[PDB]
Amino acid sequence: DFLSVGKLELPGSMIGAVRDRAIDSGVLAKLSPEQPTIFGPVKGAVFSGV
Amino acid sequence: DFLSVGKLELPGSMIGAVRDRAIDSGVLAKLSPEQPTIFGPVKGAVFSGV
């Protein structure tokens, strides 16, 4: 029997907070550029083929 | 019959001590830098997912 370290219960040390994985914002912004418009339903014309 | 190197005893020569194959120090010293901390437990919090 003796005096141990567990009886002093030193808190220890904290590394800190860090993300598990790098956040994936998502594509669809690299393929097609954004087209910011005023609020309201948008509509246009589509013409395909010859 | 004659006087030989026998009946006498020569010590010889020592070519010094050496070791077979170089020692293998741990790899973790290369792959990752050491982070010295004060004695005690080491905690860490990670926030996961979006």
DSSP secondary structure letters along A18-34: EESS-----SSSSSS--
Non-local (6+) Cβ contacts of A12 within 8 A are B40, B41, B42, B43
**Best residue of B32, B35, B50 to probe chain A, by most A CBs closer than 10 Å:** B50
3-class SS of residue B29: helix
Helices (H), chain B: 28-31
Technique of determination: cryo-EM
Closest Cα partner for A14 from B34, B36, B45? B45
Non-local (6+) Cβ contacts of B46 within 8 A are A17, A18, A19, A20
Question: Counting one residue from A and one from B, how many pairs have CB atoms under 8 Å apart?
Answer: 39
Strand-pair partners of B46: A18
Between CA A35 and CA A4 the distance in angstroms is 67
Resolution of the structure, angstroms:
3.7
